[PDB]
Design a protein around this ligand. Sequence first.
Ligand SMILES: *[C@@H]1O[C@H](CO)[C@@H](O)[C@H](O)[C@H]1NC(C)=O
Ligand SMILES: *[C@@H]1O[C@H](CO)[C@@H](O)[C@H](O)[C@H]1NC(C)=O
Ligand SMILES: *[C@@H]1O[C@H](CO)[C@@H](O)[C@H](O)[C@H]1NC(C)=O
Ligand SMILES: *[C@@H]1O[C@H](CO)[C@@H](O)[C@H](O)[C@H]1NC(C)=O
Ligand SMILES: *[C@@H]1O[C@H](CO)[C@@H](O)[C@H](O)[C@H]1NC(C)=O
Ligand SMILES: *[C@@H]1O[C@H](CO)[C@@H](O)[C@H](O)[C@H]1NC(C)=O
Lengths: 105, 107, 109, 107, 105, 110
Amino acid sequence: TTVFQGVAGQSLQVSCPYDSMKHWGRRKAWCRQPCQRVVSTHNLWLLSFLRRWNGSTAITDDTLGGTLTITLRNLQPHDAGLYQCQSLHGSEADTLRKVLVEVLA
Amino acid sequence: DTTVFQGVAGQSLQVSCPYDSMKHWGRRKAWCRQLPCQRVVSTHNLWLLSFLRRWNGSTAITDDTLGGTLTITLRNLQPHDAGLYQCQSLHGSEADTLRKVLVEVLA
Amino acid sequence: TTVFQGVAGQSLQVSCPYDSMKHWGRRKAWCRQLGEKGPCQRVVSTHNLWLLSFLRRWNGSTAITDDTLGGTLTITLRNLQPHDAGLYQCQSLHGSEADTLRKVLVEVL
Amino acid sequence: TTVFQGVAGQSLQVSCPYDSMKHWGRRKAWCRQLGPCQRVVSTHNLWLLSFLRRWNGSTAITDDTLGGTLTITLRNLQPHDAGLYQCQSLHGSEADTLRKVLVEVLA
Amino acid sequence: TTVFQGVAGQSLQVSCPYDSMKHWGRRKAWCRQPCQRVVSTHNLWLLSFLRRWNGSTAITDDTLGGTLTITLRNLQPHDAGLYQCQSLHGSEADTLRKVLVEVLA
Amino acid sequence: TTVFQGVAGQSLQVSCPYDSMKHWGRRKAWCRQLGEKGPCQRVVSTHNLWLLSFLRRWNGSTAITDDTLGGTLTITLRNLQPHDAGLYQCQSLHGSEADTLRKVLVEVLA
Ligand SMILES: *[C@@H]1O[C@H](CO)[C@@H](O)[C@H](O)[C@H]1NC(C)=O
Ligand SMILES: *[C@@H]1O[C@H](CO)[C@@H](O)[C@H](O)[C@H]1NC(C)=O
Ligand SMILES: *[C@@H]1O[C@H](CO)[C@@H](O)[C@H](O)[C@H]1NC(C)=O
Ligand SMILES: *[C@@H]1O[C@H](CO)[C@@H](O)[C@H](O)[C@H]1NC(C)=O
Ligand SMILES: *[C@@H]1O[C@H](CO)[C@@H](O)[C@H](O)[C@H]1NC(C)=O
Ligand SMILES: *[C@@H]1O[C@H](CO)[C@@H](O)[C@H](O)[C@H]1NC(C)=O
């Protein structure tokens, strides 16, 4: 597990490394813990660089470097908890990283 | 603060400007001189080709939007090129400053 | 050891030459070494496909490109800060071993 | 005749500006004074691919023909690399000196 | 109306900037003041970088950076006058810039 | 003819520059010359697919690779031994023929 803390009201940047060759062709998803799915990368894998949003949560993927980037805009106290980066393939979903987010003031 | 770059006259000077790639996602960049900030060069009008080097006179510019770095080349640097400049990020008709740069020329 | 020094807040370019024939076909890595035979932690490596070594790979604020014809490995430390100073290794990968191409001290002015 | 100073064991970049319209369509070369100037590297035989890096030994050359900048890279600079060199613009069978360069190796 | 001044018997380089995306696909012309056409860029717009000559006048176009370059080789007093850079579209021609060429001994 | 000397037991690198435009599309070969314009015993040649000329090709402890853009052929003699010494040709191949790019004397030192 990894912990990311950010000041309230600002953007928090969560980085998620993976093996770019192992997960080649797979979309990624950001979910919160069951595991409520928040956002996934674009349906067209060659457009994984595209920033996609759910509310004030953005996801973007560098598939050459193997870096998945989740952005949390306007970090509120409610946004603390436990989340997962996952790699989707068919119906299954391997966890890439489990992430705990903290807020400060 | 304002970064200082030093180059020898008659040689090429590479000025770099880091920025946050998420904050400025999708935004073109520009390079201008202070006299007001007079525009010198901007990156490609199509953001997905920001890596393509654009020239204006002896100044070139390229953008690496994934790494979050803007690179400006001052070709054949001359003492009259010394002065104050700005890396900017454009959206709508506003120009957010990313870095103030001071260019010094030597012997 | 070779010393590279740069101004803080500006990009620093580090180049490691190597024998292109001895390390033909090998991927490269840049790593940070904290002990004479210390952990030596991976920072960034070249493309998983060796014929695409020339493509810039980013990890964080570090970029790597390899010129396998000239035998020159180029590392870019973007926005150099004091915490970047220290000892690093250019390494050539084969199997699960890494051979040292060059030891590099990064100093920050 | 400009002086380019480089640290030994590191790659030294020599940059060489030229009038891009007066040398249009022309190949460029790097040579070392010995005395006659002996040819080291030249740019791509096809002028429209001059941007493509060409190596001879520990010397590389690339040409940006739009901006009018020629770049030479001395790889792994050694003490025996110091000396006088020349950027040349080729046309027919004559070579015009674009820039005389003194290379200085430090330590 | 910008002024360009060049010593007689030597090359004068006249540069006209323009908006590259606005003029995408359009060829350019150099005209002398009606407006008598002197030289225009290549018929194949993807070869606009090609230097075209009319006598001692040459024209070349950088469609990526949006810079048109006119060269008056071996400038002579009878080349002084008022000129125009133009963008050709369909059958019309829009003035990019008006250029005053001046010569010195 | 130029001499390339190496110490016995270590890799020796031979270089053959050539006019990359003149020899565009031609494979290259390293062969041992045993007579006055006579037998050229072929040792190793670059890849049969010319766009793959960068590929390292082996015969025993001898390797060849070709930089067709810069115009440089590289022969590697790994673990140089006395039986490697001799007169060699760098060749440019076309049809059934061969143009001599360079003549090389390989010498071994203990
Ligand atoms: C956005 O996140 C909420 C939070 O659970 C979820 O209910 C909703 O379905 C998401 N939107 C989309 C389009 O998936
Ligand atoms: C180049 O500079 C001129 C004036 O300095 C300006 O009119 C032109 O639009 C510029 N071009 C670019 C691509 O910035
Ligand atoms: C980037 O760094 C992280 C740890 O900081 C590591 O997990 C990942 O493998 C690295 N990426 C590459 C391509 O080396
Ligand atoms: C490289 O330079 C050397 C002189 O230092 C020369 O003999 C050789 O021919 C050059 N290479 C090419 C491909 O011309
Ligand atoms: C340019 O060419 C046109 C016809 O293409 C001709 O009428 C004109 O005289 C020429 N101008 C010069 C300066 O040669
Ligand atoms: C290796 O070279 C010898 C001559 O030295 C030759 O007879 C043999 O056929 C070569 N083998 C291959 C696989 O090319």
